[PDB]
């Protein structure tokens, strides 16, 4: 545990509820993804994370772009300068 | 009346502060803070148009039921039924 980025990807996946993770920073570029998420989603997650921030009249309001549905709900928070994509079961 | 009655109030709901409806990329109705400005009307439309285009190839063709976007002090919950988009704007708890 010198804290590596692939630690957390394998680490948050411990949870039965957590089904996949993916990371991106504002490019559409996959920086590692587990579970349900793959490279198709890197671009889509960035853009909705990116456009949802336009509703931020000004910044420092970090909109976790939560996204409900049948298979699961999908939080999306632009975060530590890197957009994170959790996929839970609620 | 009873222990289990009016007297026992029932769980409050956070206040609403904006409401919005668009149809065909056009504001049908709008109240609250979502006045007539084309900030949220325009901005959500492509947020909706992009968020709607996230198929995920596991449950295919239907990329959501509802799209919340949470802020610190206020929330947006968006719905679409046949290219009529609803946003409710409220408080968080």
UniProtKB/Swiss-Prot annotation, chain A:
The modification N-acetylmethionine is found at residue 1. Pfam families: LAMTOR5. Keywords: Acetylation, Cytoplasm, Lysosome. GO terms for cellular component: cytosol; FNIP-folliculin RagC/D GAP; late endosome membrane; lysosomal membrane; lysosome; protein-containing complex; Ragulator complex. The keyword Flavoprotein does not apply. As part of the Ragulator complex it is involved in amino acid sensing and activation of mTORC1, a signaling complex promoting cell growth in response to growth factors, energy levels, and amino acids. Activated by amino acids through a mechanism involving the lysosomal V-ATPase, the Ragulator plays a dual role for the small GTPases Rag (RagA/RRAGA, RagB/RRAGB, RagC/RRAGC and/or RagD/RRAGD): it (1) acts as a guanine nucleotide exchange factor (GEF), activating the small GTPases Rag and (2) mediates recruitment of Rag GTPases to the lysosome membrane. The gene is LAMTOR5. Disulfide bonds: none annotated. Gene3D superfamilies: Dynein light chain 2a, cytoplasmic (3.30.450.30). It is found in: Lysosome; Cytoplasm, Cytosol. Its main location: other. The keyword Cytoplasm applies. Homodimer. Part of the Ragulator complex composed of LAMTOR1, LAMTOR2, LAMTOR3, LAMTOR4 and LAMTOR5. LAMTOR4 and LAMTOR5 form a heterodimer that interacts, through LAMTOR1, with a LAMTOR2, LAMTOR3 heterodimer. The Ragulator complex interacts with both the mTORC1 complex and heterodimers constituted of the Rag GTPases RagA/RRAGA, RagB/RRAGB, RagC/RRAGC and RagD/RRAGD; regulated by amino acid availability. The Ragulator complex interacts with SLC38A9; the probable amino acid sensor. Belongs to the LAMTOR5 family. It comes from the Eukaryota. This is Ragulator complex protein LAMTOR5. GO terms for biological process: cellular response to amino acid stimulus; negative regulation of apoptotic process; positive regulation of canonical NF-kappaB signal transduction; positive regulation of gene expression; positive regulation of interleukin-8 production; positive regulation of protein localization to nucleus; positive regulation of TOR signaling; positive regulation of TORC1 signaling. Highly expressed in skeletal and cardiac muscle, followed by pancreas, kidney, liver, brain, placenta and lung. Elevated levels in both cancerous and non-cancerous liver tissue of patients with chronic HBV infection compared with hepatic tissue without HBV infection.
Swiss-Prot record, chain B:
The gene is LAMTOR4. Its main location: other. One of its GO terms (cellular component) is intracellular membrane-bounded organelle. Keywords: Acetylation, Lysosome, Phosphoprotein. The lineage of its organism: Eukaryota, Metazoa, Chordata, Craniata, Vertebrata. Part of the Ragulator complex composed of LAMTOR1, LAMTOR2, LAMTOR3, LAMTOR4 and LAMTOR5. LAMTOR4 and LAMTOR5 form a heterodimer that interacts, through LAMTOR1, with a LAMTOR2, LAMTOR3 heterodimer. The Ragulator complex interacts with both the mTORC1 complex and heterodimers constituted of the Rag GTPases RagA/RRAGA, RagB/RRAGB, RagC/RRAGC and RagD/RRAGD; regulated by amino acid availability. The Ragulator complex interacts with SLC38A9; the probable amino acid sensor. Phosphorylation at Ser-68 by PKA inhibits Ragulator complex assembly. It comes from the Eukaryota. This is Ragulator complex protein LAMTOR4. PANTHER family: RAGULATOR COMPLEX PROTEIN LAMTOR4. It is found in: Lysosome. The modification N-acetylthreonine is found at residue 3. The modification N-acetylmethionine is found at residue 2. As part of the Ragulator complex it is involved in amino acid sensing and activation of mTORC1, a signaling complex promoting cell growth in response to growth factors, energy levels, and amino acids. Activated by amino acids through a mechanism involving the lysosomal V-ATPase, the Ragulator plays a dual role for the small GTPases Rag (RagA/RRAGA, RagB/RRAGB, RagC/RRAGC and/or RagD/RRAGD): it (1) acts as a guanine nucleotide exchange factor (GEF), activating the small GTPases Rag and (2) mediates recruitment of Rag GTPases to the lysosome membrane. Changing residue 68 to D: Mimics phosphorylation; inhibiting Ragulator complex assembly. GO terms for biological process: cellular response to amino acid stimulus; positive regulation of TOR signaling; positive regulation of TORC1 signaling; protein localization to lysosome; regulation of cell size; TORC1 signaling. Belongs to the LAMTOR4 family. The modification Phosphoserine is found at residue 68.
